[PDB]
Structures are given as C-alpha cells and as structure tokens.
Amino acid sequence: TIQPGTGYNNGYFYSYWNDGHGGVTYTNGPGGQFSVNWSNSGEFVGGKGWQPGTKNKVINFSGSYNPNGNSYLSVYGWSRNPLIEYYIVENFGTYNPSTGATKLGEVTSDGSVYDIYRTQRVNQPSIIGTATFYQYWSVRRNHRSSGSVNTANHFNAWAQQGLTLGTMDYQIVAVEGYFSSGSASITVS
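Structure tokens predicted for Endo-1,4-beta-xylanase 2 (189 residues):
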C-alpha cells in the first residue's frame, strides 16, 4: 500500500489522499489498475487517470466496487479559473451525493440518464488551498462498476446549463469514502 500523494504509475497519473484517521489502504497495480480496501476509515479519495484531463476524453473503467456505507465511484476532477470540482458518479454507497442539491437538468450518456446538479463548498480544501467553489455533478441513475464515460456529453450538457469549466487539472476514476468500509478494484484506460 502506498503513501498519500500524487505521481505516475504504469503510465497513469494517480492521486491518493486521506484525512489521517486510518482504516484505508490504496494500492497501485499494473497498467491502469488500482485497489482500495477500507474498514471504518475517515475521509479519503484515491484513483488513476490523467494530469491534465481533457474535455473530450472517453474514459473506460472496469472492475469491482463494494462499499459498505458512504462512498462514491466517479470520474472525478478539477478545473481552474474557474475553480470547479466535478463528478460523473457511476455508483455510490449509502449516500447519493446530490441529496438536497438543486437539479440543473438531465443528460443521457453511455446507457443511462444522469441527473445534473450544482452545489457549493464553502471554505473547503481544494487544489489551490482553502476556497469557496462550485461542484458539478452528473449522477448516473443506473449504477455500475464497469463501463465507458464520454466526458464530452457531460461537460457539454453542463455548459448548456450555465455550468462552465475552466482549464482542466487532473481527471481520474476515483473511489471516495467518508467514514465507511469497503473494497474496490478498478482498471482505468
């Protein structure tokens, strides 16, 4: 299992972060593979992809995702100027991250309708330090742990709705958890 941080493994950018609570391990495997095992964790995010991402990447992912509690499996990334944290959520555990969020439309992509939302994080950690910034969400209605994500369909639908992205920073397939347990093994390409 590896130290929290970022870097490159077998051609892929990776990012692994946690809040120091304990109870989560992250491992890099061959190619685009990574695994996460967690048991009564704190908050964490780990996954593989690209730095920088693009606005027309077709991301493929496959494997297993078995959360027990609060967790997401998403295409996850950021833009700068404007600072935006975004998710294309393919599956989740006990909590739908759009709960209580304002719905900004729908988009159909890669075999499912997704509901679109915007939320705001206030004075929270970001790629540029503590900040207030928007989050954009596409939440897949039909949950899965393998498939293909045509990111352009999401980014274009967001743009149509007034949810504009700046310059892309990293873009990964991420397993996120908040004080939960689980296991996941995902291969990205």
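Residues 26 and 36 are 5 Å apart (CA to CA).
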